[PDB]
Subunit: 509 residues, 4 copies
Amino acid sequence: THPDISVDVLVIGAGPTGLGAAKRLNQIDGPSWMIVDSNETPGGLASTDVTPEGFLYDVGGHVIFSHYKYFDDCLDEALPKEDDWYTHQRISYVRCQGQWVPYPFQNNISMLPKEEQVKCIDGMIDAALEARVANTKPKTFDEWIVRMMGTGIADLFMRPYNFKVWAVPTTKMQCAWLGERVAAPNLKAVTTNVILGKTAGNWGPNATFRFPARGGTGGIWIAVANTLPKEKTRFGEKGKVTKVNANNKTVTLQDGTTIGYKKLVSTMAVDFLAEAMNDQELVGLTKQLFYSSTHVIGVGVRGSRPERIGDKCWLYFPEDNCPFYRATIFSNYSPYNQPEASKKLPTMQLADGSRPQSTEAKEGPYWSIMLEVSESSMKPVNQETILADCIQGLVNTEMLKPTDEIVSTYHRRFDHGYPTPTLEREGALTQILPKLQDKDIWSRGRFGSWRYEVGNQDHSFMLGVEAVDNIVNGAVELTLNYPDFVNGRQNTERRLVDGAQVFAKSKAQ
Amino acid sequence: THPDISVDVLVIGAGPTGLGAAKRLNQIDGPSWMIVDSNETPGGLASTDVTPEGFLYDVGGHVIFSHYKYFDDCLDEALPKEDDWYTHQRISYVRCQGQWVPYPFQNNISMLPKEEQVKCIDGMIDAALEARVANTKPKTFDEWIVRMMGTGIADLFMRPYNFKVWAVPTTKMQCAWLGERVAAPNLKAVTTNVILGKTAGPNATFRFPARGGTGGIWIAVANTLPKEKTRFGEKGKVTKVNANNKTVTLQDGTTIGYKKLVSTMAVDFLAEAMNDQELVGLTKQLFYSSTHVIGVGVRGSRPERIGDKCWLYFPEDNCPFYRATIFSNYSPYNQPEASKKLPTMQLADGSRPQSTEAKEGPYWSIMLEVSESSMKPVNQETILADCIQGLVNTEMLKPTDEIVSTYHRRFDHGYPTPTLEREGALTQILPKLQDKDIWSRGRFGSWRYEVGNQDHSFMLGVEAVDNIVNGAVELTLNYPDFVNGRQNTERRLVDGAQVFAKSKAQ
Amino acid sequence: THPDISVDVLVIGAGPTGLGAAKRLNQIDGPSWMIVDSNETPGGLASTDVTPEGFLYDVGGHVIFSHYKYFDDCLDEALPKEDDWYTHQRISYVRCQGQWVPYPFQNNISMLPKEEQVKCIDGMIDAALEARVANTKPKTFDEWIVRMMGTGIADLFMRPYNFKVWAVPTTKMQCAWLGERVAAPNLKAVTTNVILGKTAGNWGPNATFRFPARGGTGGIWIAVANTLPKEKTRFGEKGKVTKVNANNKTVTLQDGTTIGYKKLVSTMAVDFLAEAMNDQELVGLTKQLFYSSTHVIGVGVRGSRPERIGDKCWLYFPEDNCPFYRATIFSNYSPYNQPEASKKLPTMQLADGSRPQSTEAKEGPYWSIMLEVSESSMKPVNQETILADCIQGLVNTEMLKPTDEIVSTYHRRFDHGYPTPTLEREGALTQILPKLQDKDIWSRGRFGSWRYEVGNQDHSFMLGVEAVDNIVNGAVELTLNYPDFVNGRQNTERRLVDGAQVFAKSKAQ
Amino acid sequence: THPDISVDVLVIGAGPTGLGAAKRLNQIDGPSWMIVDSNETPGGLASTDVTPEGFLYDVGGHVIFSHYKYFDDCLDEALPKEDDWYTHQRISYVRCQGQWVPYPFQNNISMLPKEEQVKCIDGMIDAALEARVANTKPKTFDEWIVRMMGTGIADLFMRPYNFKVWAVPTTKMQCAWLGERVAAPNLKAVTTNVILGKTAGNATFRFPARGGTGGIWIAVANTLPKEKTRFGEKGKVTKVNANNKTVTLQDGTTIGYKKLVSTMAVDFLAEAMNDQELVGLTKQLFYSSTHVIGVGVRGSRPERIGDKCWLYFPEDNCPFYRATIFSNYSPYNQPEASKKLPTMQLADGSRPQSTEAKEGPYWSIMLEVSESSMKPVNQETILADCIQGLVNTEMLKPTDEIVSTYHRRFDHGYPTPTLEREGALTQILPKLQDKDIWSRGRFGSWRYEVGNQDHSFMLGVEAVDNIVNGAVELTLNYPDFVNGRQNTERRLVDGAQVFAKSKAQ
């Protein structure tokens, strides 16, 4: 019984990964292919929501750094205008004891209370002397943190911050995900800055990342998707997969439609994939994995951008005076992420939670704040009070004066937000992925692979690109199995226009 | 002006590297391509010569272990019959003080005289203690050796042997080529064997062609190539390379135009043919050694003591060769059958035969290698006599043994020497050539011994093409450690592209 | 009220320590002095007992190495003839798995089952590697052992043997007592003998110790005591101290006699001293000290000395096929430690434990075996049965045949056998000794100072000598406070005839 | 034949070492003894000279820390009044880049310029990381310095300073002499101070109120029975016959001894013995000569330099390696304000306005300069260069009026801890010992570790105690042992003397 549709390669999911596979599939333009997604808007969790008042909010951060030229070609194609991008300085600050400590944290303890400085330096001196002798590798994320920068810096930043991040204690996670690099501290660099009292960090003006002028991050994956042949695309309720028969290689859609495939590139969460296949073996193995939920809170506020935050990026918060682990002045990325000044809007509430004087609609200008909070069984989140608690924190950290007028609020909860690099992660993945692979199924992506190391928009995109390259050209899936390898090098070989397309085109001439 | 022939991808050289490139270019079957070689018989320095008496002798050894599936696939295609191959045990012995020490050397010191075992163990104990503290990497091959297995084993084996091999002292060579594995000994392993007296079944295996020798593989492989895209013989000899206009001048005058050039000739010859004085200067910084390949056919049965098909390494001074093997053990067709009659040329002791009568066999064969360089000269007139004598000293030939054949050929460019100055030159030479759309690859193409093996060189060409076409990462070129530490299964002789393009017609 | 007797320096106890003080006091011959002991026979716990059948047994071992020339002069004086001493080779064996493993045990594992050789070598290799990096000192006797020769040799010899010796597990003892010599194994030496199958250790022929030709060890201290002015000695029931009044510097004897002193050198067990002072403070502190009891078993046997046991030395037993931790062929030290061959003695029992054939008295020759068993609250000893167990042990270790005729037996139990180098030892001693010192009481000796490191005859003797030298000439008590210092050097300065005596005799001339 | 005099024990030299032997010989009061010295004034190179103007200068420093109670007892006896001593704080400074770095140097790098602190901490971070792995002992003085405090502190202070002191590069000297304390820096201690910006290293030493340091040894000698002494031209040793145990004096007097305690320089001793074997071995020893300069200045003492202590100078803007405001130890080391003295010259070197003698008050400075075959010293200009240095280091204003100058050169100033030292002494000392000669002292034993006044004094004390009571010579053979502990056992009144007195009663 032949299916309704028959393609060589079927890509499920129109996120960075899905589009990655699709963009390479369409570049090779050889075997037949098709891409599906239950959402009519391509980009997935890399999209950009908007508020009724017109405030944009990235659901999945932004690419501050790409490791592949291929990824760059694909972005340059979608948004080819210099006016499509706003280059920004890669900045970073850590909120510690009423201080904005620039990245990296260690090289800036010179602006912490001197007593604290001592506890830190001593801690590193211990880590530096133990490293000089260390003959083993760290077993947990915790051990990895100590060895790298002593207990002192381990009690002020890393430990407490990484809990608010992964909602899981550092002792329950592996550390191989961080890289192959030796866990050894640099005393000279840290002591020097303390002595000179010198402060530094970020990078100027060389280290820069680009952000899309309009539409937020979602606009990027939208533009890319539009470079595809629309007949091969299938987005919306018509593209929602409900059943996956790995045995006869047939996918059933929600309406009932069935698609046959020779190779399957799945970018949905593997735990969902397992159920769609109804394989109690995979469902059992997938349950061994672990993830955290994330609350993306947004806050629009009237007035110009406060001097004390100026040029921006993200801010890390290791302390207790706030529920969020990181924040960001999203208004600093592009003026079009907010309504213009002329736009008039009523004030919903003040920063202290008080009532607005008047309900009248006053005009801008406007600036916007975006932040994130993690949820898991070890770190529960009150869905109702977390938005108000964030606004409180924004005040505690002195990012909002209680007299600040909030014009817009935002709050969405993502069940699958962070593929946790637990200690049991690989023990499970070393079974799951091979099994799926035996069924000619390439499960790749942030939750398709379940490896945070390669969950970035540039990594995920290449996962798809490489999964395909493997299926067709038998290319090695580097990013999937060797994160350190790709990260520690400039990947420039593969381009949007390889010698194949060059020769086939000059072939006509 | 337009050249006589014009192809997208021109491959120069018909060795494993060249044939590797050709195989991928022919698999992809997209962009126009052509492979040339000044020699009319494909295979290059991986070919098999034959003596007038009928003895086979490979000139570039054989593959004991493949690192890629794509390499196996191409071999299966050239020799599809099980009968085309013989499977042998991977084994190795070091001749040290009248003893045959199993590989690996350090795990079998229990074969050495005990007094010597002490000096080895003590040395490793020093190594083990220093490794516990080491915070840097070895800088020379010699440093690496010491850290790995101490001075005891260094003076007994590693140091003397590696000079006989590279014709260059261990102190003049880098050590990164050996891999990125930490230079630290394993006492517990070494001590255990000595204590238990144990000497380290199915075992791992390698395959050798039933007929033709190693060269027979590359001939069969080249046959699966569209003959019209091949040009072997004096008609394919490259005499000039114009990198500016991308044109290659053959010996007969024929000119070939290319977009991409995969050159597999010695990069010092390439620079010459380009008349690029800059490259010639840089290329002079590289170093290499010359190898003498000697072969000896002898009447009678094989010595009982040495039945295994493998390598025998010789660190000592009682023989000029550093490497030897009973080539007749690999396949019974590397030497004439028993019924064939041949006269005795000389006895192993160098004496004269009693008569010139042509008698029957059977026959066994030995091959051995000798290295030559400015730091290690070789008398080409007496080297063979010295080898035979050495074959007596190592008790591989009785002075009474009857020698039936002698083979002797000298290869100018034998080994690409991993010197301390190598990468210093190669990081200039390769990128520049790359800026002219020229992929200089291979044993002497890229000059890296780490990947100068048959299976490595073959992939250097394959990957080079895959880089030119599908924009693949040349992993074997820039990351020997990576490809060597894993099983390269992805790339196949039949990839998804061919499967899908074919089933499409259906 | 004034004491019946008055001296400047009073020495309580006529063991090696007390005798040492007396000898230096008689040599100086300046300040008035007197030495008392409740025992009629001088020598203390370094005496020699005799069985009815005429077998000698040292209750306190014998000197195998002198660390001081002064100790030599005094022995030379007491026993001036060459026919008074027998010089023997310092040899030693450890009984391990049916093998006599020469000292040191590590350098002779080349005699154990090869499977054992492996576990030992690996252990040392681990020890050698950790030592190269070690930046701290061992805290207990156990850590010190592991650091020296790895767990392999630790589980085979050290650990089990040292419990049988100290009646306390190696984890409950300090290791400062062993010396300041760095705990690091010698791999090359050990592996060499294993490879060569070489055997050596019990040094010869210049590593020698001398032994008294007659009277056993006890004869030495009896001869040494005789060199003293008898009117200054007071041994027997007339010399028993029953009370010490530190406040008015008076001692009360059993008969009621009182001796007044300026300085007191008390060589009795410090815990008993505290009790004879009625000082509850010192009694409490002294309770924190720990000791073990020792049973000394003797076995006289008919026949010549077997060939295997051969020469004169000590034998160590880590294994539990015997109750004793060390044994010695006491008949090899001197022919006069047992009856002559013409002496007729009946057979008491056979080694197997059965009753002999006839009760008739037969001739010799005879040989003797001496051994020791420790006792504590953690290692109890059945006093009624331990003798038969030792004899059984001698059979199991194959020192006696079941057919060997036992002619004599000996069994004495010493309550205070060994001063135990527990972890709490110096916590108490650094309190006890100073307090007694403030009262002008030099508490010195095996149980006077409670430090086993210097509890030997040669050490003890000097503890007394140096105590007197400190009292009179203000000398430094090196042996008491710096064990390593004296042991690691040749003490030749102090002689039985110093310049003081020489210049006084020549001034005479 | 028989000698003019015959004693059981003869002591040669009335310096701290010799007097230490005489003090114990007299305390024991048993065997016959006598002590000689070619100088009528006892104290040796621990004496105190005086300028014609009335300024005192110690030729051999002063004790800042005693390691023996016996040493204290003997000074207490010589100067029994409390008014005899002044107690000052133990302190010292290093002059580095117009800065006064408190001791110890490392713990006060927070006084150096910021940039310099980086080089120093970076250097120590290297030293600390290497010591964590070190498995051998330093072979030279230099190696010891590099391991202890890194190359930064080495190039800035230690290396250049030590050459000015020993007149020999740090690479030519052993390092056992500094002690057996593990050569390893303390980062936490050093970093803490820099971080806290705090400055730190009560602890005191005593200095005689009158007569300077020499006054001490003069009083100590006075406690000896004069008939057993013999100081002056009459006590000069000119010959030593070690075979018949007879010493000849300059006048011709012959002294017969049983044991000889010689405290003269061992190289001179060998000469006086006419023993070519020892003379040869003695040549392997090395020493530096020292110049002791004294400056008398009119007016009050500079504000910033009020503490009486040592000031060390590693830099080359002055020839001296150490200096001290000797006028801060006691107001009696210089003339009283009412004293009238003419100005000899100004600190800038120029001439005075008038030659009239004006009143004080006065203050004083002393400094030391080393000399050797590897560090020559011009004797005719060294004084003027030291004055210039005092100006460069800003201790003297070019307008300061100099009222007195002192300059003496000592051939045998310091016993150099060279690499060859022990190889020579382990032969020389035993050989003399076999001849019943106890060659002890600063140049008698040649070991700088124990060449201080408190050590030297004990070298004699223990030499006698060895000859008489058979005591171990700890100070001679185990400097670390005696230094790392408080030596309280031996006292000026031992139990021997208590029991002899109470025996009379």
